[PDB]
Amino acid sequence: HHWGYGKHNGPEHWHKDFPIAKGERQSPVDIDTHTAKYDPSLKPLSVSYDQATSLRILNNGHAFNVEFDDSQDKAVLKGGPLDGTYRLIQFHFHWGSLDGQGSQHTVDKKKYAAELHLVHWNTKYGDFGKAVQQPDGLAVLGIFLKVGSAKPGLQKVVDVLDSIKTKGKSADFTNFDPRGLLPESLDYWTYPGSLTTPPLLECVTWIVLKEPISVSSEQVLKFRKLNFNGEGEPEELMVDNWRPAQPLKNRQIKASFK
Ligand SMILES: [Zn+2]
Ligand SMILES: [Zn+2]
């Protein structure tokens, strides 16, 4: 019926409604660190988030999104493998039922507890919807989360989850600074790929940071209490909202570091 992460509507069935699932530039992938090519032609990333305007937090039934005002160049990504300015529209996570799984990308087959995705669209295209129809329409920063010490900057997000427990709920979520979620280092890997959830459009340039951020066990635990279902429906915990690694096919992963 509609796609999800269960046995009957899980990643393995997506191809039936979204044939691009078996495409040539599908995400995520495993990052073989010994095969990634260092490319000294890659510029350092430029993350300008001093003017970010968060608006809302929403449970959409497959994850929770923090949405920003993208009506102007307030929170932008440039540099790196990118040409042009990319505006931040929303951020969301992918996580598992246990600490040993949850991230989309893997590093030498290592899975992380979760993966944060900061989603950006190419301003030359005027709006998010036109951006997704272009091969260079989106830039997604992926950041791994390992369990260890708490991430102070993530606490504001953890505390509001109680209020958006089920699909379709939202809460005002202003004055949230996304800079509190960045690792100290901006070294990355990059490859041409796709969205990791339906419609799996091949429009993304992936920017996967090397350094994971740490979250406490208690913080990740809160993620696992959200629900996939809407209010008044049988309870289905929102966990394992990740897709298996896809074949790299004709692609090369480039590293910004050696
Ligand atoms: Zn994602
Ligand atoms: Zn596209």
From Swiss-Prot:
Regulation of activity is described as: Activated by X-ray, histamine, L-adrenaline, L- and D-phenylalanine, L- and D-histidine, L-His-OMe and beta-Ala-His (carnosine).
Known EC number(s)?
A: 4.2.1.1, 4.2.1.69
What does UniProt report on the pH dependence of this protein?
A: Optimum pH is 6-8.
The cofactors it requires, by name, are: Zn(2+); Co(2+)
**One Pfam short name:** Carb_anhydrase
Query: What EC class is this?
Result: lyase
- Which residues are listed for Zn(2+) binding in this entry? 92, 94, 117
Q: Outcome of residue 196 to D/E?
A: Strongly reduced activity, but enhanced zinc affinity
Gene Ontology molecular function terms on file: arylesterase activity; carbonate dehydratase activity; cyanamide hydratase activity; zinc ion binding
Q: Does the keyword Metal-binding apply?
A: yes
Gene Ontology cellular-component terms for this entry are: apical part of cell; cytoplasm; cytosol; extracellular exosome; myelin sheath; plasma membrane
Query: Which disease relates to this protein according to its record?
Result: Osteopetrosis, autosomal recessive 3: A rare genetic disease characterized by abnormally dense bone, due to defective resorption of immature bone. Osteopetrosis occurs in two forms: a severe autosomal recessive form occurring in utero, infancy, or childhood, and a benign autosomal dominant form occurring in adolescence or adulthood. Recessive osteopetrosis commonly manifests in early infancy with macrocephaly, feeding difficulties, evolving blindness and deafness, bone marrow failure, severe anemia, and hepatosplenomegaly.
Family listed = Belongs to the alpha-carbonic anhydrase family.
Q: How does it assemble?
A: Interacts with SLC4A4. Interaction with SLC4A7 regulates SLC4A7 transporter activity. Interacts with SLC26A6 isoform 4 (via C-terminus cytoplasmic domain).
Identification of the protein by name: Carbonic anhydrase 2
Species of provenance: Homo sapiens
